[PDB]
Design a protein around this nucleic acid. Structure first.
Lengths: 64, 187, 145, 75
RNA sequence: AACGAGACUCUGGCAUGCUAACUAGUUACGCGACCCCCGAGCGGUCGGCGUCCCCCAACUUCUUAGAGGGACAAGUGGCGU
RNA sequence: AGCGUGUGCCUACCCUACGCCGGCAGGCGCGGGUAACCCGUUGAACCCCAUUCGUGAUGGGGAUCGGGGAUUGCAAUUAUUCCCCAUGAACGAGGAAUUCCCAGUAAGUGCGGGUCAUAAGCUUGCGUUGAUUAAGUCCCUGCCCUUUGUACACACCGCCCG
């Protein structure tokens, strides 16, 4: 039923998305196994090397 | 000797930041220790320059807000000063630890963006987490004082103490736990 | 405390014995903040006490000063009736006497049918104001036939 | 729509409570005394100055808009 | 090849470098005067306070305003048919 | 604090120190200024420190209305403006909608100029206290360029069928 929190590090910024340009699209590399990577959408201002907190790791999203 | 500055009365060296995502964005210790939460610095001139402002001055700026209070920064320094003196009597703890833990508990970490009544879930960045936390706990202090014999210095102390333990009596914790409930339904 | 009487009746009007003495007596018509302070200053009363803390002879000293200002050396420039039109006197008018003094003034203007008396009778603005856009108290009217 | 009914002068049931409650509170201030005893802020201001001259409480800080008091140097 | 754009004109921020001031000031003293002893130490040479007052003292930092100076994507690292 | 104005050339009025009388608005006397020279070191407001009130349409708010006193003017009633005592409304952050704004900026706060015999709730300038949020997009309303279609040229607010 339940799943744990994961932390992941920003490795590249890819562009801006949403109807008004509101969300940045970004690539992240996990803090446990450094060989893993995924892409995500983020609401606020973002910079390369920021650390995000993920409430689910298994979901992945393209262009909304 | 001049390497330690007590902010009038309170030490910075014993403070700890316990979320590794926020250590870069909550400015405390070292070059960020000052005597007063008031400077004339040009923090607005570039995108990430905002992150170099001491966290007690960011609380002081966000407090001089609601129309009749615009520009009145000298009044707003003494509200923060008398709130920290009440926090030390109630808790016995360092007031800077109570502020840092209230910021770490109050910032939301998932939210849902608007696309057409229709929404989609997205991640929140560490700079927007610290921006959201300050606005929520300033709003919580401001709404409680509006028709009570309680001063704003007492309401800002009550709001920070309840947020530092996550009690859900504070305005900031109820609003964080509303935003993450709504976004969890938009996955 | 003494559990003393905390509502009292002074000039056919009720005073709450619970406010500061200088703000309790302004419940009398004809007695504002400015006049109430000067009466208590001539009466030799301490302004710090609550209105239920006055003794029976202290309220009679205040009442006898309010009704005769000119004999306790309250100035002529302080008073609310100056050279009264029918008999030339100077005085302060209080309680139900102030209601009748206005009632006589509006009828005196109406009897000779001066412009003031007609505006007071038709219910219009009496001083210089415009009437096209302010003071509206009727109902919205539709254009339809 | 509602009304408070705060007292303007003490009675023994609340004045003996004022003297019994002194050690219980880490923070003593006119507003917390007002809401807890059902007392006006001007009577709460007056009552806390008497306890200071009796030596029963410590003044922590004073300013036009905010006084602060605390328990007598133990606990 | 022509007009618009840009250049151009006024304005803001820098000069202890220049020119030079009783319708602008500073510092200092021949000094002179009132007040305080708080000061090593006295009621003093010497200390403190001044839009208190002369200079036939010295000067231009603060004020005024004329001439010139200065910034070019010029220097270093990436990206670009 | 900073920007300004000042004896009106027909046209007949200017900016004010100091002393005295009056609670106040105001009155009398006597000097300076055609201005880096006199009002003037332009003792501005918010802000700052101490006091009183105590969650009450309240010592919040000040509309409406009675009586008296000065000043301008040839003349003040349909109240010119100003001063004093009294009276004490709606209003507890505003439905569907909708405006302006990116740094000494928004907003707060007061002061000059214009109009002026008498007089800003307007407008055009100046200083003072001083933030939150962005560093983007074409979704809504529009603009520029190219390809494309048309029965439009009065130009889509067009033309046209039973």
């Amino acid at each position: 039923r339940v799943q744990p929190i994961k932390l992941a590090r920003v490795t590249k910024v890819l562009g801006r998305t949403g109807s008004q340009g509101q969300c940045t699209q970004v690539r992240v590399e996990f803090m446990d196994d450094t060989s893993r990577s995924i892409i995500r959408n983020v609401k606020g201002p973002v910079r390369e090397g920021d650390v995000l907190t993920l409430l689910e790791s298994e979901r992945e999203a393209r262009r909304l | 000797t001049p390497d330690i500055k007590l902010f009038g009365k309170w030490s910075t060296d014993d403070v700890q930041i316990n979320d590794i995502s926020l250590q870069d964005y909550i400015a405390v210790k070292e070059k960020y220790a000052k005597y007063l939460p008031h400077s004339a610095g040009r923090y607005a001139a570039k995108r990430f320059r905002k992150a170099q402002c001491p966290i007690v001055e960011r609380l002081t700026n966000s407090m001089m807000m609601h129309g009749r209070n615009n520009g009145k920064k000298l009044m707003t320094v003494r509200i923060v000063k008398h709130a920290f003196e009440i926090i030390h009597l109630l808790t016995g703890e360092n007031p800077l630890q109570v502020l840092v833990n209230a910021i770490i508990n109050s910032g939301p970490r998932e939210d849902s963006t608007r696309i057409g009544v229709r929404r989609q879930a997205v991640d929140v960045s560490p700079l927007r987490r610290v921006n959201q936390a300050i606005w929520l706990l300033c709003t919580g202090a401001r709404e409680a004082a509006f028709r009570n014999i309680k001063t704003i210095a007492e309401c800002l102390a009550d709001e920070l103490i309840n947020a530092a333990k996550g009690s859900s009596n504070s305005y900031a914790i109820k609003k964080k736990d509303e935003l993450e409930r709504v976004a969890k339904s938009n996955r | 405390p003494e559990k003393f009487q905390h509502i009292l009746r002074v000039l056919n009007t009720n005073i709450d014995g619970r406010r500061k003495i200088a703000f309790a007596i302004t419940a009398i018509k004809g007695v504002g903040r400015r006049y109430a302070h000067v009466v208590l200053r001539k009466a030799d009363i301490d302004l710090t006490k609550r209105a239920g803390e006055l003794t029976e002879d202290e309220v009679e000293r205040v009442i006898t000063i309010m009704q005769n200002p000119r004999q306790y050396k309250i100035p002529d420039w302080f008073l609310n009736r100056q050279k009264d039109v029918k008999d030339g006197k100077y005085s302060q008018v209080l309680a139900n006497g102030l209601d009748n003094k206005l009632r006589e003034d509006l009828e005196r203007l109406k009897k000779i049918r001066a412009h003031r008396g007609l505006r007071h009778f038709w219910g219009l603005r009496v001083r210089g104001q415009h009437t096209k856009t302010t003071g509206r108290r009727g109902r919205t009217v539709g254009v339809s036939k | 729509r509602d009304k408070l009914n705060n007292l303007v002068l003490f009675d023994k049931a609340t004045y003996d409570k004022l003297c019994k409650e002194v050690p219980n509170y880490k923070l003593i201030t006119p507003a917390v005394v007002s809401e807890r005893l059902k007392i006006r802020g001007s009577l709460a201001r007056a009552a806390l100055q008497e306890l200071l001259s009796k030596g029963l409480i410590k003044l922590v800080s004073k300013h036009r808009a905010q006084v602060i008091y605390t328990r007598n140097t133990k606990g």
